[PDB]
Amino acid sequence: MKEFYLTVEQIGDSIFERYIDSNGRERTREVEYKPSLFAHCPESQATKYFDIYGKPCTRKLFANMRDASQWIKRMEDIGLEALGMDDFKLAYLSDTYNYEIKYDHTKIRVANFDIEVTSPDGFPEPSQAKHPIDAITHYDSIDDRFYVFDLLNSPYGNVEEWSIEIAAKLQEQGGDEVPSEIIDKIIYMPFDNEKELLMEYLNFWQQKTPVILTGWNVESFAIPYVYNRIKNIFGESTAKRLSPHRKTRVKVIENMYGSREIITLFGISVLDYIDLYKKFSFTNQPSYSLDYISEFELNVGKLKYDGPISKLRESNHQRYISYNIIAVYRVLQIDAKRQFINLSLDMGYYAKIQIQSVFSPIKTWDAIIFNSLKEQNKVIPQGRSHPVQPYPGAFVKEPIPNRYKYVMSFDLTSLYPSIIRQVNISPETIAGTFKVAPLHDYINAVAERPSDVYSCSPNGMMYYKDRDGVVPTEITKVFNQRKEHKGYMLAAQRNGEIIKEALHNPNLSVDEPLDVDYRFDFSDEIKEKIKKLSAKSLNEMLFRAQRTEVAGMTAQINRKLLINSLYGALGNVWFRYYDLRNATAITTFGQMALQWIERKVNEYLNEVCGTEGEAFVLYGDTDSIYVSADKIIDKVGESKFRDTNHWVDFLDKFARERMEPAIDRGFREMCEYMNNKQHLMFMDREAIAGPPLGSKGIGGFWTGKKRYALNVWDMEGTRYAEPKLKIMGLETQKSSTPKAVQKALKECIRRMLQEGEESLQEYFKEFEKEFRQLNYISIASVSSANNIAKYDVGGFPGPKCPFHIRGILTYNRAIKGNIDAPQVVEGEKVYVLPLREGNPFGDKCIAWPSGTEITDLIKDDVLHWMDYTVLLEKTFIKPLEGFTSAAKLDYEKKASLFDMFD
DNA sequence: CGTTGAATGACAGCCGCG
DNA sequence: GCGGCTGTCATTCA
DSSP states (O other): OOOEEEEEEEOSSOEEEEEEOTTSOEEEEEEOOOOEEEEEOOTTSOOSEEETTSOEEEEEEOSSHHHHHHHHHHHHHHTOOOBSOOSHHHHHHHHHTOSOOOOOGGGSOEEEEEEEOOOSSSSOOTTTOOSOOOEEEEEETTTTEEEEEEEOEETTEEOOOOOHHHHHSOGGGTOOOOOHHHHTSEEOOEESSHHHHHHHHHHHHHHTOOSEEEOTTTTTTHHHHHHHHHHHHHOHHHHGGGSTTSOEEOOEEEOSSOEEEOOEETTOEEOOHHHHHHHHSOOOOSOOOHHHHHHHHHSOOSOOOSSOHHHHHHHHHHHHHHHHHHHHHHHHHHHHHHOHHHHHHHHHHHHTSOGGGGGOHHHHHHHHHHHHHHHTTEEOOOOOOOOOOOOOOOOBOOOOOEEOSSEEEEEETTHHHHHHHHHTOOTTOEEEEOOOOOHHHHHTTOSOOSOSSSEEETTTEEEOSSSOOHHHHHHHHHHHHHHHHHHHHHHHHHHHHHTTGGGTSOBOOOOOOOOOOTTSOOSSTTTSSSSSSBHHHHHHHTTTTHHHHHHHHHHHHHHHHHHHHHHHHHTOTTSTTOOHHHHHHHHHHHHHHHHHHHHHHHHHHHHTTTOSSOOOEEEEETTEEEEEOHHHHHHHOGGGOSSHHHHHHHHHHHIIIIIHHHHHHHHHHHHHHTTOSOOOOOEEEEEEEOOOTTSSOOOEEEEETTEEEEEEEEETTEEEEEEEEEEESSGGGOTTSOHHHHHHHHHHHHHHHHTOHHHHHHHHHHHHHTGGGSOTTTTOBOOBOOOTTTTEETTEEOSSOOTTHHHHHHHHHHHTTOTTSOOOOTTSBEEEEEOOSSSTTOSSEEEEETTSOOOHHHHHHHTTSOOHHHHHIIIIIHHHHHHHHHTTOOSSSSOOGGGGOO
16 A cells, blocks of 8 residues: 555644554654755756746745745745745655655544533633533544543532433433444443543543544534643643643634634644534535434434433432433434545545645645646745735626516526636736727627637637646646546446346356446456346445546546636735636626627527527526527417427427537637637527416516526426426525414415415415414524624614524523523524514513524523514515516405506 | 625614694 | 615525
8 A cells, every 4th residue: 555644734844643553553753854946047047847827937946945935934024926825734744755645544643532521600611611521532544433422520410420321222222222233332321520531532542543533513512622731730731631742832813703722732633523514515504513414324313311400410410411322322323414525535645735825726736737747847926915806797687577487498508617718818828918808898799709719718818829827727637537537437327237136036156346448437357247247246246346437527527616716816916816807707708708609509599499689698697598488388279288308308408409519519609709719608498487387377487686586497407207396586495484484485485486376375375374373493594693782782782782682681681690591603694583572571682593493591581572474474474465466466366456556 | 714796685874844 | 654765584486
C-alpha cells in the first residue's frame, strides 16, 4: 500500500503531520519544511517556471516558513507580485505526496462522541462548564466499540450503575431496547467522582487519539464543554492534551447576530455531522435536532423518557445512560446511509487538502488547480484582495400568473461550468474588450458580431481561441474523470447482471472467484468460464462486483460536487482566480443563452403551428425553460388519444424528433455569432405535465417567479405510475408553514391539478368545518428565532419587533419563574401560535422551540386561548386565495366575478 | 463559518387623505 | 381604517 496523510498543521517554523506509512502504522513527524515562492524575473534569465500568463519566473527556495511570509509581506511593501502557494501546508502536501492518493479508511481512526450534563439552572454554557460532565459515549471506528463513562456521584445525585442486561430488554419489560447490533460492542466504565472520570477519559484519548472527530453538534458543545470543564478543574495545560500537539486555539466566530466560540484542536479534523449533513443532504428541514433528523432517515429517533432531562439522571439514571449510547449510535446509522464521512475523505484526498477544508469550495479548488499547474512547472497567481462588488446573475422571467394545462420543460446541462468551457473564460485568456450593445440586441441577433477573431461574452469580454485556459482545462478534466468513473460504474452494473444469473442455478466445484476488472466488462478472457464456476465462486464474486459498483458513485459524486462549486468560488473575492469581469461574462452569457433559445424555441413552434408570434415559452429560470404545449396538443386533437400515456408519448416524440434539433441548430448559430471556442449548449427535455386525460383538472399553474406547480407524468424519460406533483415556492414547501396546513394546501393543490374546481371546493368546505379539531402543533407555525435581544426592552415589545420574536418575548413573559422551562437560544427555529386577544400572555403571539412540545406549565393555557379564526385565515386561506386566483378558480362556490380588478 | 445572484411574502411603521 | 412604498426578517428556485 502507498502511504498517505491523516492530518497536517503548521505551528511556527514547522509542519506537524499524522499519517499512515508503508505498513499501515500511524506515525506522526515534525518537518522543517522549506517552502518555495516566485517573482517575475528577466526572460534573459532562462528558467523553467512561468506564471499562467506566460512570463518567466524564478524559484525562491526559503530557509524556513517565516522567511517565506516575511518575504511575502516584504514584497507587498515594495509593490511587487509574490507568486506561489502561500498555504505552505498545501504545498507541503503536493510535495510529500506527488501522485494519486489511494487510502485505506480502515487505518484512519474516526471517533464519534456525545456527552450528557445534568443542569438545573438552564442550558449548560460550554464556555463555562459550571456543571459536572456526568456521562460520555465515545465510539471508535478502529475498534468498532462504544466506550461509555458513567459518573456515579455528583452534586445532583448518586446512582446505581447502568445494567447492560436491562438496556437490552424490551420496552414493555423495562429495558431501553438498545439494539443487538451494538450490545456486544459497548464498554461500560463507572466512576466515583468527576475528576476520577475526566482524567480517565483524557487518558483514553491519548491511547486512541482521533483523526476524524465527528458526532452531532460536537463542535459547539461536546468539545467546547469538555475542553473548558477540564480547564476549569485542571487548568489549560491539562486541557490542551486534548490535542496531539498540545496546541489549541479559541477561534472566535462572530455570527451575524452575536457570538459563540469553538475550540481548535491542532492535529485533528473536526467534521461535525450536523454540518456534514447540512451541506451534503441538500434539503431544508424545520429542525436539525438529531432527533428530527433521525426519525427522518431511519424511522426512529433518540430514546424517549418521562420527566425533564434535567431530572432524568436522578429519577432514572438507567435510561439516561442508554439514551447517551443510542444518541451516538443514531449518527453512526445515518452515516451508514449517507457516507458523508467517506465522501469527505475521498474529496479531501483527491484535492490534497486538510479533510475539513472540504467544507470550503475556494480551498478545494485552489488546491486542485495548484497541483495541476504545478505538475507542468507553472506558478499560481498571487491572491489579491478585491472590493466586494455585486454583479448581475441569472435571468428569471416574469411569468404571467395563470394555469397552464400542458407544460414541457427542457434544461441546459451544467450551464455555468459549460459556459466557461465554450467561451474559454480564465484570468489569463482574456484577449480584450469590445463595444457593447444592449443585451436584447444580442438576443435577437441584430447586433454587430463582437469579434471575428476571439471568443465572446455579451458583456464585452473577449477570450483567445487558440490557447485553452487554466480554469476551463481543469473543469474539462473533472468533467471527463466523472464520465470516466461513472463509466466504471455503468460497467459493474452489467457484470452484476451476468453474475446475478449465475446464481439462478449454480454448480458444484472447488473454484475461486476469477480475477477481472469490473471497471471494464467481460469478453472471453473470463466471460467464458462463467459456467464451470461452483456455487461458492459465483456468490463471493458478486460481493466483489458491487463493492466496486459504489466505488464509482463516490468519485462521480465528488466530481459533480466540484463541477457545481467552481462557479461559486469564481464569484468569490477570496479566490485566487477570481475576476469581476469573468464572473459577469459567465453570468451575462447564460442570460443571453437562456433568452436566445427562448426566441428560437418560440420561432420554431410558430412555424410548425403557423401561428402569429404566440408566446410559447411561458417561463424560464436560469438554465431552464417551460413550454406551454396547448397549441401542440390541438394540432392533433385532444380527442384522438387513447388515454393519458398516449398524449405523453406524443409530446415526448415531438420533443426529441422535432424540437431538440431545432434547439441544437439554434444554439449552434449562437456559438458562431459569439465565435466561441466550442459549442457546448445542450438542452434536454425534462418534465412533461398536464392533467389526467378526460378530467376537469387544470394540470399546472404559476403564481409568479419561483412560484408554481405541475402535475408531471414523465421526468427525463422515466414514466410515472401515478402523476407526481412538482410544487415550487408555494407554502407547501415553506418549512415555516403549519403541518396540518402544509398538508391540506398540498391536497388542495392536487385536487386542483387532476380533479378540478369542483373538488377543491368540497375539500376546503370540510377542512374549514372540521378545523377546530386539530392537534395544536399541527396547526402551529415556524421560523428562525434571531435578534431576540435587539427587541426585548424590559422583556416587552420595542421597535419593529418581528411577529415571531415578539412572540418569543411573550414566552419569556410566561416562563419567568420556572427555570425548568426551555428558553429559546438565538439561531434556532421556533413554533408560533396566534392568541384570541384578551388573554394571560397579555399580548398577541407566543412561540417556542421547533420540534418540541410546549411546557406543561403554560401548555394548557394556550390550548384554550389560541385564535383559530385568525390562524386558519392567515396560514391556509390567505395563501390558497393567492393560489386559486392565479389558476382562476374558487375555493368556495358562489363568488362575485368582478372581484379581480384594480 | 464554509460558495452567487434573483425573488417571494409575513409583518412593523410612516405618509398622504376633509 | 387602507393602499402604496421602503425596509427588516425568512426562505427558496436555479
